[PDB]
């Protein structure tokens, strides 16, 4: 059974700058509904600071993966457990600012 997941790209602040259409099946929103918003806008109040802090640290970790579990508000306003695996990228031919690549999977908290 394939896990349900989608890829996203974020600026270092956490704003969605790209969203894979598999988001509709995963969390119920169209890409347009996510683009331009901070991931933290979709995050459970108890988990928001952890997510901020995760985004802050992933840029320090030399491009290694940082994982975070958090509750994501679906299009139906229900809290879905997500495991987001995130890493930085920047084109080595450039000095343009790093951005963050996430794979976001709906997982069990059990």
């Amino acid at each position: 059974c394939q896990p349900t997941r989608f890829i996203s790209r974020h600026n270092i602040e956490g704003i969605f700058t790209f969203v894979d259409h598999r988001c509709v099946a995963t969390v119920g929103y169209q890409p347009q509904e996510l683009l331009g918003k901070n991931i933290v806008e979709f995050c459970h109040p108890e988990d928001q600071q952890l997510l901020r802090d995760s985004f802050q640290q992933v840029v320090k970790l030399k491009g290694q993966v940082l994982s975070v579990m958090f509750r994501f508000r679906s299009k139906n306003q229900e809290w879905l457990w997500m495991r987001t695996s995130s890493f930085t990228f920047q084109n080595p031919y450039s000095d343009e600012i790093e951005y963050i690549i996430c794979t976001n999977t709906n997982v069990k908290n059990s």
Binding site: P3, R5, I7, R9, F18, D20, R22, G63, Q64, V65, S85, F87, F89, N91, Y93, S94, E96, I101, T103, T105
Partner: protein
Amino acid sequence: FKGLDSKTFLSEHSMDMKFTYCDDRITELIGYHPEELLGRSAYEFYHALDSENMTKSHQNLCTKGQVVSGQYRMLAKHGGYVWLETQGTVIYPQCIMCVNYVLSEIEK
């Protein structure tokens, strides 16, 4: 001349290198529609002269969890090859996430 964003595309793969996702940036670059790539192994697209090296990089990626490929050639949809470099990352294994950047025009 193309900007940086326009020369990069993201792909996702199963552990066997079969495409499970590819962003649409590949179309302008290499000609493929993402939907025609799904279920096809990345190996189907490597130049013969890069195949042994890509096998080794795949091995490194699976062993270590991350890899930067050497420069390699990907077969283009309408013939010829484009030079690429890829940063690969295993997501735990669940799948492989690739950041692919084009290093050349299509060469025939």
